Design an enzyme around this catalytic site. Structure first.
Site, PDB file in Angstrom:
ATOM      1  N   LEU A 126       0.823  -1.210   0.000  1.00 33.75           N
ATOM      2  CA  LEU A 126       0.000   0.000   0.000  1.00 33.75           C
ATOM      3  C   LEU A 126       0.866   1.274   0.000  1.00 33.75           C
ATOM      4  CD1 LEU A 126      -2.871  -1.128   2.444  1.00 33.75           C
ATOM      5  CD2 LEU A 126      -2.987  -0.816  -0.012  1.00 33.75           C
ATOM      6  N   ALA A 141       4.845   3.067   1.917  1.00 37.32           N
ATOM      7  CA  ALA A 141       5.786   3.010   3.028  1.00 37.32           C
ATOM      8  C   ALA A 141       6.178   4.405   3.511  1.00 37.32           C
ATOM      9  CB  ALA A 141       7.032   2.204   2.621  1.00 37.32           C
ATOM     10  N   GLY A 176       9.690   4.762   8.360  1.00 38.05           N
ATOM     11  CA  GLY A 176       9.963   3.760   9.381  1.00 38.05           C
ATOM     12  C   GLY A 176       8.900   2.674   9.469  1.00 38.05           C
ATOM     13  N   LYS A 234       0.155  -2.699   8.997  1.00 32.67           N
ATOM     14  CA  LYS A 234       1.357  -1.877   9.106  1.00 32.67           C
ATOM     15  C   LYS A 234       2.419  -2.603   9.939  1.00 32.67           C
ATOM     16  CE  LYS A 234       1.605   2.773   9.649  1.00 32.67           C
ATOM     17  NZ  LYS A 234       1.632   4.169  10.263  1.00 32.67           N
ATOM     18  N   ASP A 258      -0.384  14.090  14.533  1.00 32.17           N
ATOM     19  CA  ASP A 258       0.237  13.936  13.220  1.00 32.17           C
ATOM     20  C   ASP A 258      -0.797  14.072  12.093  1.00 32.17           C
ATOM     21  OD1 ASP A 258       2.462  13.666  11.484  1.00 32.17           O
ATOM     22  OD2 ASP A 258       2.485  11.512  11.577  1.00 32.17           O
ATOM     23  N   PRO A 302      -1.871  14.924   4.976  1.00 34.36           N
ATOM     24  CA  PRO A 302      -2.680  14.203   3.973  1.00 34.36           C
ATOM     25  C   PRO A 302      -2.531  12.685   3.956  1.00 34.36           C
ATOM     26  CG  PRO A 302      -1.832  16.257   3.021  1.00 34.36           C
ATOM     27  CD  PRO A 302      -1.148  16.082   4.384  1.00 34.36           C
ATOM     28  N   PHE A 319      -2.886   8.334  14.772  1.00 34.39           N
ATOM     29  CA  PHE A 319      -3.002   9.248  15.903  1.00 34.39           C
ATOM     30  C   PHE A 319      -2.250   8.665  17.125  1.00 34.39           C
ATOM     31  CE2 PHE A 319      -7.030   7.116  15.082  1.00 34.39           C
ATOM     32  CZ  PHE A 319      -7.217   6.356  16.236  1.00 34.39           C
ATOM     33  N   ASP A 340       7.601   7.489  21.421  1.00 34.66           N
ATOM     34  CA  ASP A 340       8.984   7.619  21.878  1.00 34.66           C
ATOM     35  C   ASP A 340       9.894   6.592  21.210  1.00 34.66           C
ATOM     36  OD1 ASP A 340       7.897   9.507  23.675  1.00 34.66           O
ATOM     37  OD2 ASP A 340       7.579   7.931  25.174  1.00 34.66           O
TER      38      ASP A 340
HETATM   39  N1  LIG Z   1      -5.759   1.489   6.426  1.00 37.57           N
HETATM   40  C1  LIG Z   1      -5.136   1.725   5.346  1.00 37.57           C
HETATM   41  N2  LIG Z   1      -5.725   1.498   4.148  1.00 37.57           N
HETATM   42  C2  LIG Z   1      -5.229   1.844   2.911  1.00 37.57           C
HETATM   43  N3  LIG Z   1      -4.048   2.402   2.735  1.00 37.57           N
HETATM   44  C3  LIG Z   1      -3.394   2.635   3.892  1.00 37.57           C
HETATM   45  C4  LIG Z   1      -3.883   2.337   5.173  1.00 37.57           C
HETATM   46  N4  LIG Z   1      -2.969   2.740   6.122  1.00 37.57           N
HETATM   47  C5  LIG Z   1      -1.906   3.208   5.423  1.00 37.57           C
HETATM   48  N5  LIG Z   1      -2.109   3.200   4.067  1.00 37.57           N
HETATM   49  C6  LIG Z   1      -1.184   3.700   3.048  1.00 37.57           C
HETATM   50  O1  LIG Z   1       0.103   3.349   3.440  1.00 37.57           O
HETATM   51  C7  LIG Z   1       1.052   4.452   3.279  1.00 37.57           C
HETATM   52  C8  LIG Z   1       2.259   4.299   4.204  1.00 37.57           C
HETATM   53  O2  LIG Z   1       1.818   4.683   5.511  1.00 37.57           O
HETATM   54  P1  LIG Z   1       2.857   5.150   6.562  1.00 37.57           P
HETATM   55  O3  LIG Z   1       3.841   4.024   6.870  1.00 37.57           O
HETATM   56  O4  LIG Z   1       2.165   5.488   7.817  1.00 37.57           O
HETATM   57  O5  LIG Z   1       3.664   6.318   5.899  1.00 37.57           O
HETATM   58  P2  LIG Z   1       3.268   7.833   5.649  1.00 37.57           P
HETATM   59  O6  LIG Z   1       2.107   8.224   6.553  1.00 37.57           O
HETATM   60  O7  LIG Z   1       2.897   7.857   4.197  1.00 37.57           O
HETATM   61  O8  LIG Z   1       4.584   8.678   5.945  1.00 37.57           O
HETATM   62  P3  LIG Z   1       5.383   8.892   7.333  1.00 37.57           P
HETATM   63  O9  LIG Z   1       6.011   7.488   7.811  1.00 37.57           O
HETATM   64  O10 LIG Z   1       4.458   9.454   8.399  1.00 37.57           O
HETATM   65  S1  LIG Z   1       6.621   9.978   6.986  1.00 37.57           S
HETATM   66  C9  LIG Z   1       0.194   5.672   3.558  1.00 37.57           C
HETATM   67  O11 LIG Z   1       0.827   6.806   2.956  1.00 37.57           O
HETATM   68  C10 LIG Z   1      -1.167   5.236   2.975  1.00 37.57           C
HETATM   69  O12 LIG Z   1      -1.196   5.551   1.592  1.00 37.57           O
HETATM   70  O1  LIG Z   2       1.696   4.438  12.889  1.00 35.90           O
HETATM   71  C1  LIG Z   2       1.854   5.516  13.468  1.00 35.90           C
HETATM   72  N1  LIG Z   2       2.522   6.582  12.916  1.00 35.90           N
HETATM   73  O2  LIG Z   2       2.978   6.427  11.565  1.00 35.90           O
HETATM   74  C2  LIG Z   2       3.914   5.330  11.457  1.00 35.90           C
HETATM   75  C3  LIG Z   2       4.930   5.644  10.350  1.00 35.90           C
HETATM   76  O3  LIG Z   2       5.039   4.528   9.435  1.00 35.90           O
HETATM   77  C4  LIG Z   2       6.320   5.900  10.929  1.00 35.90           C
HETATM   78  O4  LIG Z   2       7.189   6.249   9.851  1.00 35.90           O
HETATM   79  C5  LIG Z   2       1.400   5.671  14.882  1.00 35.90           C
HETATM   80  C6  LIG Z   2       2.115   6.535  15.730  1.00 35.90           C
HETATM   81  C7  LIG Z   2       1.805   6.607  17.090  1.00 35.90           C
HETATM   82  C8  LIG Z   2       0.778   5.819  17.593  1.00 35.90           C
HETATM   83  F1  LIG Z   2       0.454   5.924  18.880  1.00 35.90           F
HETATM   84  C9  LIG Z   2       0.054   4.956  16.763  1.00 35.90           C
HETATM   85  F2  LIG Z   2      -0.961   4.254  17.309  1.00 35.90           F
HETATM   86  C10 LIG Z   2       0.342   4.864  15.394  1.00 35.90           C
HETATM   87  N2  LIG Z   2      -0.408   4.060  14.541  1.00 35.90           N
HETATM   88  C11 LIG Z   2      -1.811   3.913  14.368  1.00 35.90           C
HETATM   89  C12 LIG Z   2      -2.775   4.621  15.129  1.00 35.90           C
HETATM   90  C13 LIG Z   2      -4.155   4.463  14.898  1.00 35.90           C
HETATM   91  C14 LIG Z   2      -4.563   3.536  13.910  1.00 35.90           C
HETATM   92  I1  LIG Z   2      -6.569   3.279  13.537  1.00 35.90           I
HETATM   93  C15 LIG Z   2      -3.626   2.847  13.128  1.00 35.90           C
HETATM   94  C16 LIG Z   2      -2.273   3.025  13.379  1.00 35.90           C
HETATM   95 CL1  LIG Z   2      -1.151   2.189  12.387  1.00 35.90          CL
HETATM   96 MG   LIG Z   3       0.805   7.385   8.081  1.00 39.29          MG
END
Ligand SMILES: Nc1ncnc2c1ncn2[C@@H]1O[C@H](COP(=O)(O)OP(=O)(O)OP(O)(O)=S)[C@@H](O)[C@H]1O
Ligand SMILES: O=C(NOC[C@H](O)CO)c1ccc(F)c(F)c1Nc1ccc(I)cc1Cl
Ligand SMILES: [Mg+2]
Ligand SMILES: [Ca+2]
Ligand code: NA
Length: 312
Positions: free
Chosen positions: A36, A38, A41, A59, A152, A155, A171, A179
């Site tokens: 989907l 990345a 991290g 994730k 956080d 978009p 969130f 942390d």
């Molecule tokens: N529930 C979900 N359903 C569909 N696509 C998703 C879902 N969760 C995440 N994605 C996609 O997965 C991508 C990667 O998510 P993240 O790892 O959280 O990275 P990011 O938010 O794009 O950038 P950072 O890590 O905050 S800099 C997102 O940009 C979304 O496009």
């Molecule tokens: O995933 C998070 N941030 O983005 C991660 C990114 O890939 C780092 O580069 C994140 C950060 C703090 C926290 F408390 C969470 F619960 C997180 N994840 C998160 C929260 C709610 C739902 I619904 C789904 C997810 Cl997954």
């Molecule tokens: Mg994200």
């Protein structure tokens, strides 16, 4: 503003009923369908949960830390089982396996707004009125029901689907995960947060405002588009440390005049006031002229979205 629609109440009930059928999540129970996207991290996959047959978004946050630590994030993340709202991405479960933490959630077939924006070019004001409603409602929900602020908004953290739903994810429900991680962009952070000063939900309001300007104009809006950039845009590069200094020291971005309604420009301006004390709050935004107008409009978000991203 947290009262549920009939159709909304029903969809929530259906998600919960399905969820109840899912047991403890384990690594071997998932088959990868596709990638989907990345972040800095984490990677996210569209996966099939074999036993239940449910498709989820999984994730994986690869982190090398003692069983002691990991077991604590998993604990805090359990709060997600209590975050049930039409404006918050559904959660299935969290587990640790072979170095990485897995967070399994509802799959949103329209992806995130950064993906939609890249496809669309720019998103129309009426569509952003619905997005604004969802974000404010999602933040109100987290605050009211869980005394949590997002931390956080950007978009890529606002997800959409072919049913026309718009939802927040990523969130700060777990302090330890925040942390133990923590490099995510700071480019949507409020000036007060960048300055190490006062941060509350007010800071998420700034991020939402900046995200709306980017989606409206089709470009991350700092530094502002010069007269000739706007001319090509509607007819009508800075290193990260330079950009964060700009945000703290320069006036906030604004929509270009003459292409957006004055209500929409006023709404974004109130979200973007640098002084968090003067910046509008959730209660005030919920009754802003732009929000009342948008709530009354019958906007076919799903039809627009499906046509735009070529969904199907
Ligand atoms: N529930 C979900 N359903 C569909 N696509 C998703 C879902 N969760 C995440 N994605 C996609 O997965 C991508 C990667 O998510 P993240 O790892 O959280 O990275 P990011 O938010 O794009 O950038 P950072 O890590 O905050 S800099 C997102 O940009 C979304 O496009
Ligand atoms: O995933 C998070 N941030 O983005 C991660 C990114 O890939 C780092 O580069 C994140 C950060 C703090 C926290 F408390 C969470 F619960 C997180 N994840 C998160 C929260 C709610 C739902 I619904 C789904 C997810 Cl997954
Ligand atoms: Mg994200
Ligand atoms: Ca395994
Ligand atoms: Na695995």
């Amino acid at each position: 503003e947290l009262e549920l629609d009939e159709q909304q109440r029903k969809r929530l009930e259906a998600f919960l009923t399905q969820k109840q059928k899912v047991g403890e999540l384990k690594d071997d129970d998932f088959e990868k369908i596709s990638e989907l996207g990345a972040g800095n991290g984490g990677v996210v996959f569209k996966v099939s949960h074999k036993p239940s047959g449910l498709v989820m978004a999984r994730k994986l946050i690869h982190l090398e830390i003692k069983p002691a630590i990991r077991n604590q994030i998993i604990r805090e993340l359990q709060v997600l089982h209590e975050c049930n709202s039409p404006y918050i991405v559904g959660f299935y479960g969290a587990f640790y396996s072979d170095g990485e933490i897995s967070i399994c959630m509802e799959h949103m077939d329209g992806g995130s707004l950064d993906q939609v924006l890249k496809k669309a070019g720019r998103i129309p004001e009426q569509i952003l009125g619905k997005v604004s409603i969802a974000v404010i409602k999602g933040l109100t929900y987290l605050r009211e029901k869980h005394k949590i602020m997002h931390r956080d908004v950007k978009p890529s953290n606002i997800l959409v689907n072919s049913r026309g739903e718009i939802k927040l994810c990523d969130f700060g429900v777990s302090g330890q995960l925040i942390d133990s991680m923590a490099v995510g962009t700071r480019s949507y952070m409020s000036p007060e947060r960048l300055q190490g000063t006062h941060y509350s939900v007010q800071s998420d309001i700034w991020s939402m405002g900046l995200s709306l300007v980017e989606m409206a104009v089709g470009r991350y809006p700092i530094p502002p588009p010069d007269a000739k950039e706007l001319e090509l845009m509607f007819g009508c590069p800075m290193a990260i440390f330079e950009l964060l200094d700009y945000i703290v020291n320069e006036p906030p971005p604004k929509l270009p005049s003459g292409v957006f309604s004055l209500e929409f420009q006023d709404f974004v301006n109130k979200c973007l006031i640098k002084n968090p004390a003067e910046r509008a709050d959730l209660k005030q935004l919920m009754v802003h002229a732009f929000i009342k107008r948008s709530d009354a409009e019958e906007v076919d978000f799903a039809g627009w979205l499906c046509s735009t991203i070529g969904l199907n």
